[PDB]
Every structure is written in structure tokens, then in C-alpha cells.
Write an enzyme that holds these catalytic residues in place. Structure first.
Site, PDB file in Angstrom:
ATOM      1  N   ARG A 225       5.369   8.336  -8.336  1.00  0.00           N
ATOM      2  CA  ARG A 225       6.691   7.737  -8.559  1.00  0.00           C
ATOM      3  C   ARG A 225       7.004   7.362  -9.997  1.00  0.00           C
ATOM      4  NH1 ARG A 225       5.131   3.719  -3.767  1.00  0.00           N
ATOM      5  NH2 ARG A 225       5.936   4.942  -1.998  1.00  0.00           N
TER       6      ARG A 225
ATOM      7  N   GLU B 299       1.935   5.497  -6.219  1.00  0.00           N
ATOM      8  CA  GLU B 299       2.570   4.829  -7.358  1.00  0.00           C
ATOM      9  C   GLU B 299       2.566   5.677  -8.625  1.00  0.00           C
ATOM     10  OE1 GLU B 299       4.257   2.694  -6.613  1.00  0.00           O
ATOM     11  OE2 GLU B 299       3.418   1.210  -5.218  1.00  0.00           O
TER      12      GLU B 299
ATOM     13  N   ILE C   7       1.659   5.813   2.606  1.00  0.00           N
ATOM     14  CA  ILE C   7       0.444   6.295   3.234  1.00  0.00           C
ATOM     15  C   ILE C   7       0.523   5.730   4.666  1.00  0.00           C
ATOM     16  CG2 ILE C   7      -2.041   5.763   3.291  1.00  0.00           C
ATOM     17  CD1 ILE C   7      -1.430   6.021  -0.055  1.00  0.00           C
TER      18      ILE C   7
HETATM   19  C1  LIG Z   1       3.642   1.588  -1.250  1.00  0.00           C
HETATM   20  N1  LIG Z   1       3.830   1.062   0.143  1.00  0.00           N
HETATM   21  C2  LIG Z   1       4.645   0.009   0.443  1.00  0.00           C
HETATM   22  N2  LIG Z   1       4.644  -0.235   1.796  1.00  0.00           N
HETATM   23  C3  LIG Z   1       3.803   0.689   2.354  1.00  0.00           C
HETATM   24  N3  LIG Z   1       3.458   0.860   3.685  1.00  0.00           N
HETATM   25  C4  LIG Z   1       2.575   1.878   4.009  1.00  0.00           C
HETATM   26  N4  LIG Z   1       2.249   2.066   5.326  1.00  0.00           N
HETATM   27  N5  LIG Z   1       2.045   2.702   3.012  1.00  0.00           N
HETATM   28  C5  LIG Z   1       2.365   2.553   1.676  1.00  0.00           C
HETATM   29  O1  LIG Z   1       1.807   3.443   0.772  1.00  0.00           O
HETATM   30  C6  LIG Z   1       3.284   1.499   1.332  1.00  0.00           C
END
Ligand SMILES: Cn1cnc2nc(N)[nH]c(=O)c21
Ligand SMILES: *[C@@H]1O[C@H](CO)[C@@H](O[C@@H]2O[C@H](CO)[C@@H](O)[C@H](O)[C@H]2NC(C)=O)[C@H](O)[C@H]1NC(C)=O
Length: 246
Positions: free
Chosen positions: A163, A160, A71
Site C-alpha cells: 500500500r 502495508e 490477511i
Molecule cells: C491491515 N488490517 C486491518 N484490519 C485487518 N483485518 C484482517 N483480518 N487482516 C488485515 O491484514 C487487517
């Protein structure tokens, strides 16, 4: 674009929204039957927009990076909110441009940083569809501390779940009641990268992992995954982060 309305949502409609989300992500090849995500994509085609509606009908549009499912930021009425990190900043140039003001959140979007700003680890934050409704509600009106918590719920009930079949199933059980996540869930969330890499390294190695991956299971017992015949590979994981990103 993909849309989900919490009003009238039941386990079935959620399942359909998550299926839609998966199908919204491009891929040219499958590895051991699982969609392999693209290495990179050019321009505005790199972002997917999610329209989420809370029970009362209010909405926020969330921008997701299609090469990882991360995101990047979101839009509430006329203010855009982006994470404080390079990719997010890059993303601000293609989405939510018609927004009146853009705010950069005081933290980047990775779990570690979000858990600090929220004041609690995600082990203790309840998730489910009711919580998604709250999350959306909380993001409509700015509050960096509240947003951290809401984003941890949003990232998990969408990205999540996309996935991992297991995590989508966990959320369907929490359709009318929130519950903190099981350690299996946390474990999976944390291994998406490793598993993604190892399932790809097994392609010219008879389906055997170069390095075993360690998770915690349904019961909370430490388990080792050494090969693609495992349930995690045959039935759990649904998307693979391309190694070119790791
Ligand atoms: C799951 N995840 C791990 N690092 C992340 N970093 C961002 N910006 N967005 C995410 O959904 C994310
Ligand atoms: C690959 O993983 C499977 C598990 O899915 C390993 O399974 C062995 O056989 C049963 C069921 O498959 C397991 O419960 C046993 O504990 C395993 N015994 C062995 C042979 O260690 C299988 O061994 C693995 N195969 C590899 C490493 O190629």
C-alpha cells in the site's frame, strides 16, 4: 499466486515480490494514477495466495482478500488458521479446503485486537526481513500469543508495504537488521482508509480533499494533507481502498 523466499533475499528481491503482490491485485480504473481496488469480487477469485518461505525453506501459504489486502488466515502444513471474524470465516469456504483441521484464532485481525493478544503495541515490535523469517517460523507451530506478534510483523512487511512505497522502503533498510517502525509508518498504516476516501472525493473537486488528513512525517512533525499534489499522493500510496468499503 505470489512467492517470496527469505533465503538469499536482498533489498532487490523483496522489491520485486512487493511489486508482484501489487500487480496481483485486480482493478479496472486508476484514480489520479493510483490503482483503485475493486468494490467486491465473487467466489474464490476474491483471494490471493502468498507462498512464503523462511530461510530454512519451510513455508506457509497466506490468503489475502484482493479488495482490501487484508490477511484472512493461512496454512501451515495441514492446519489452516483463520481470524475470528465474519470475512475470515467466509474466506474459509474457498481456500485451504484440503486441510486436515481448521483452527480459529481467538481474535480478529485488526491492529487493536492483535496488539492486545500480543501484549505489546506495534511501536515496540521490530520489523524487517529477519523478523519476517521469525514470523513464518513462529506460525509453523501454533501459539496464539506468539502468532499475534508474528502476524503483526507479517501484515506490515507485506500488506502495508504493498500500500505504501515508503513502508516498502523502510523494510528494505531493515533487510539484514530489524528495527521498530517509525511513527510515520504507524501513521500511514492508520490512514490508508482516510486517504483512500479523500483522494476519491477529490476527483470531482479539482483534486482538493473534502477533509484534510493528518499524518506524522519523517522527522516526527505533524503534517496536513489537503490535496493530491502532495508527495503522499504523487509518490507514496500505491493502492486505494474503494469507498464502497468504508
Ligand atoms: C491491515 N488490517 C486491518 N484490519 C485487518 N483485518 C484482517 N483480518 N487482516 C488485515 O491484514 C487487517
Ligand atoms: C496543496 O498542497 C501543497 C503542498 O504540496 C501546498 O503547497 C503550498 O506551497 C508549498 C509547496 O507546494 C507548501 O510548502 C506551502 O506550505 C503551501 N503554501 C500555501 C499556498 O499554503 C498547496 O498550498 C496546497 N494547495 C491547495 C491547498 O490547493
Amino acid at each position: 499466486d505470489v512467492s517470496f523466499r527469505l533465503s538469499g533475499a536482498d533489498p532487490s528481491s523483496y522489491g520485486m515480490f512487493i511489486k508482484d503482490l501489487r500487480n496481483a491485485l485486480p482493478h479496472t480504473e486508476k484514480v489520479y494514477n493510483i490503482p483503485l481496488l475493486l468494490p467486491s469480487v465473487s467466489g474464490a477469485g476474491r483471494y490471493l495466495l502468498m507462498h512464503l518461505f523462511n530461510y530454512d525453506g519451510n513455508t506457509i501459504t497466506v490468503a489475502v482478500d484482493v479488495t482490501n489486502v487484508y490477511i484472512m488466515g493461512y496454512l501451515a502444513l495441514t492446519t489452516s488458521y483463520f481470524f475470528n471474524e465474519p470475512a475470515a470465516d467466509l474466506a474459509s469456504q474457498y481456500v485451504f479446503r484440503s486441510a486436515r483441521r481448521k483452527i480459529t484464532l481467538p481474535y480478529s485481525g485488526n491492529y487493536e485486537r492483535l496488539q492486545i493478544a500480543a501484549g505489546k503495541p506495534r511501536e515496540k515490535i521490530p520489523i524487517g526481513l529477519p523478523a519476517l523469517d521469525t514470523a513464518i517460523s513462529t506460525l509453523l507451530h501454533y501459539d496464539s500469543t506468539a502468532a499475534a506478534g508474528a502476524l503483526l510483523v507479517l501484515i506490515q512487511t507485506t500488506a502495508e508495504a504493498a500500500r505504501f512505497k515508503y513502508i516498502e522502503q523502510q523494510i528494505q533498510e531493515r533487510a539484514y537488521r530489524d528495527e521498530v517502525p517509525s511513527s510515520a509508518t504507524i501513521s500511514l498504516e492508520n490512514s490508508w482508509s482516510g486517504l483512500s476516501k479523500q483522494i476519491q472525493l477529490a476527483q470531482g473537486n479539482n483534486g482538493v480533499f473534502r477533509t484534510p488528513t493528518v499524518l506524522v512525517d519523517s522527522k516526527g512533525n505533524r503534517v496536513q494533507i489537503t490535496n493530491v499534489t502532495s508527495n503522499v499522493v504523487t509518490s507514496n500510496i500505491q493502492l486505494l481502498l474503494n469507498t464502497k468499503n468504508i
